[PDB]
């Protein structure tokens, strides 16, 4: 069930983070994987290596998805190599915490150019390059609609748009039968989660944060990776234009 | 590969409909399947058969899930037969079209007794009887909040609550490591769709609503229930996934 | 000098306007110059202060009894409401109960206790309202923030009893629309009422409990019926017409 | 009760369309009003004159809510001229239609600069200028969450972000007892509306989108804003209020 054999995926921000486990978990299902990074080539080459190890194929392309020309070159290079593209997961993203009063122009642009503006043009170049029956996944947050942490407003709205984009994308991308969904991850243990959770030591806060879920454990990249896999399968087809929140009954 | 070998599933109203693909599917993933039903024996037996056919086991147990004592006895029986239950699935439900002005008490109770009360006690009995790390799946609709379909007030509240039950049930049913979600089917092609598609060509135009320009089919949602009841779906919890296909 | 959103000429019915949000939803509608049908089941004397308090600011009220768990008493409630004032414009469904219990402990009787008033009752008040209202009327039904906005443990019956009221108002808007009637719902979130002090359990005096509950709000205070009635008194005005079909959450951006 | 005697408001882009009837409406409720325009000073004059001409004072100030340095001067000058500014309203109109395939770097930075980025910084400056116990309001669309027009992919996000902001801005601005809500207009007859109806024949059949069988007009919205910002509308904080008369 829900394998991706003879399919080729692209996953942005896949050298470290929910993205790496998305790819690896695509590769496991039989997807040939394009492992995008921008600043971590060492862990990109570890994902690519670990995707091949479990019996698939992968390349690592570097590209800054704040630059749109570098996104066209990402998707151009990606089809030039493997033959075709079916699946594109928009995952690259940054967190930002700060009361409204102190949010500067420079901070707002940093966060949106990647989390909102970037994704949009990673989605756009996904469609223009994608086989029919293809797949597009974008990354939102559960702080988008479901949880309202103070001094968190900039990051929140950066993903809210993402929630709104997918719904309309799902319409416009019918004429190639591509389905558009976001996953909205919650407290998933990554460099980004530990960086947030201050608002004691990261293990101490990871231990505590395990309680928010009634399952009484943390969320991990594998947790979210598994959901993209389903939605990016042919078996996930009828989930189209939906935002799946993946926190685990947390609050 | 998210299968359910050596696990045991129960599917209410699994004789005909979306709950007949949610049975077989859980059987194609290699679960043992208790096909529940009420006024349709032949159907549930062709289902219990098809599930045997792909190398799993199944049984037909009849029970009206409008009746809370029958739901007790259904799960009491299920566990008696396969030795344990891992996955409970609330499929059963009726449709109803009528302007607020014309809805009567009989008609209010006819719908709620099964779609809302029924599914609630199915979910009570599933918690009491289920293993740790188990799955309750309940069934709502897209007419719940998404679609404002005229003369559809009664169906919607029945399923609206189902949307609320899973969010709270997820905090409640956690003392046994059980996850709780609903699937909000759209207009999956079944006996119901046809009784309320408003001849054949009714459906032929429904296809064009979804941007994929085809209809929703029972096995299109079964697939979503299968993932949610797998080991891999465990971090989806308290959520009502909407399987509309992009319809509008 | 513009005095907006008055209800002069108009006649309104609030279910469970003896105590809680309905009293202040009836006094306030009263304050805005409307003639008001106070409804109560077991609080008759309370219901009579709320008529007097309404007559006091120079309108007119009556206190009709009816248990809205019983559908024929809903019909009689409304038949009477017109048979006194001569017409009905506004209809407010505030009557409702609370229940804490783990899914596993929730009996048939408790489900029926709650659902029969919180959902079924409200449904038929909404039905008999569309039937008895002047064209251009308003129907407000009450819900909660525990309906979707918040997931409180051992709270499952309530959330779904009031989580059907949210599905209802979006479809009722269209149905009643063939008489130009706006159907919206209010989501009382933490209103300080006998139903709040009941829940503020989940040792500590209720005051102690609400003083603390106040911290929860970014506005650091409690919700009071006064707060909710003010929204109801917009929703129903001539001017609240383009708010149609929506569930308003009136909790204070609280968590 | 419902009045604004003593209060000074601000409304961005309140020369034309809704923001203007939201400027006139607050004037009607006895607020003084900073009108704000970028391109239409002659409209910005008709408003100041109408608001003077029902008892309240008004000034018009220019500002490209795109340039953040211009947002700042606008608010500095508003406190300066009136001595306070309890209310602040956000009206940023740039509709854009197209397919994800034909959307450019340039159109995004045009819509999102005023629709998203502008509104964010109007909201920042509003906070830092406002009398404690004051108000901020933002303008989204029903096409944020409740609808899916095949082509608004960008506009919908340009407002769906606004929808998330208000929910966190309600927590932030609570340390001055300011409430922050977004009104989310449906189809509302303006210059923007006649632009993306794609004559009056395009509007006469829009009159039937709502179950009240008329169109939305600026007043319809202006009145709701008028409540949100009224003293009585306090306990609605951090919300979207979709104002579309129940339109599908
Ligand atoms: N876990 C959570 O709490 C959570 C919650 C909600 C949403 N998310 C979303 O999940 C996604 C990833 O989370 P995470 O846990 O992976 O966080 P993370 O550890 O911070 O991941 C950072 C990822 O972002 C990539 N990145 C940063 N700047 C980039 C640029 N200019 N171009 C391309 N990629 C860039 C990084 O690649 P480099 O290797 O080049 O740095 C890396 O892949 C984000 O999209 C975020 O919005 C996470
Ligand atoms: N099909 C759709 O288009 C659609 C769309 C939206 C929502 N839904 C929801 O999905 C579920 C069913 O859809 P459907 O298409 O499967 O329905 P369907 O084809 O009409 O089938 C009705 C199912 O209900 C069972 N049933 C009815 N009353 C029962 C009772 N007292 N006890 C046990 N079983 C009973 C029937 O089994 P027996 O006759 O064997 O007793 C049959 O399985 C419902 O939950 C409905 O609310 C369906
Ligand atoms: N208060 C909150 O914290 C809160 C939170 C969420 C939702 N709500 C919703 O707000 C609404 C009202 O709450 P509240 O603060 O008023 O609570 P309250 O103090 O419990 O109000 C009780 C009201 O219920 C009426 N009532 C009870 N049984 C009735 C029956 N059979 N028929 C007609 N009326 C009946 C009562 O009148 P009698 O005197 O005749 O009993 C009284 O008006 C409810 O819908 C509730 O779900 C409240
Ligand atoms: N009308 C609708 O149907 C509708 C529907 C949904 C949402 N909305 C939302 O409502 C708002 C406007 O609707 P409308 O019908 O009122 O708009 P409209 O007729 O297009 O009027 C636009 C207003 O935007 C102002 N504006 C444009 N660029 C500006 C800038 N750089 N700086 C300051 N002001 C600027 C204009 O000012 P100048 O022209 O004076 O330069 C004018 O006041 C927008 O927020 C829109 O997203 C409207």
Numbering used by the authors:
A (entry chain D): 11 to 209, 217 to 268
B (entry chain C), D (entry chain B): 11 to 208, 219 to 268
C (entry chain A): 8 to 209, 216 to 268
What does the primary publication say about this deposited structure?
To understand the catalytic mechanism of CbAR, crystal structures of CbAR-NADP+ and CbAR-NADP+-Emodin were then solved and refined to 3.30 Å and 1.85 Å resolutions, respectively. It shows that the crystallographic asymmetric unit contains four molecules, but CbAR was eluted as a dimer in solution. Based on structure alignment, although the root mean square difference (RMSD) of superposition for the Cα atoms of crystal structures of CbAR-NADP+ and CbAR-NADP+-Emodin is 0.25Å, the regions from residue 209 to 216 are clearly different. Upon the binding of emodin, this region of CbAR-NADP+-Emodin ternary complex is visible, which is absent in the CbAR-NADP+ complex due to low electron density, indicating that this region plays a critical role in emodin recognition and binding. Ser151 plays a role in stabilizing the substrate. Tyr165 serves as a general base for proton transfer. Lys169 can not only form the hydrogen-bond interaction with NADPH but also reduce the pKa of Tyr-OH.
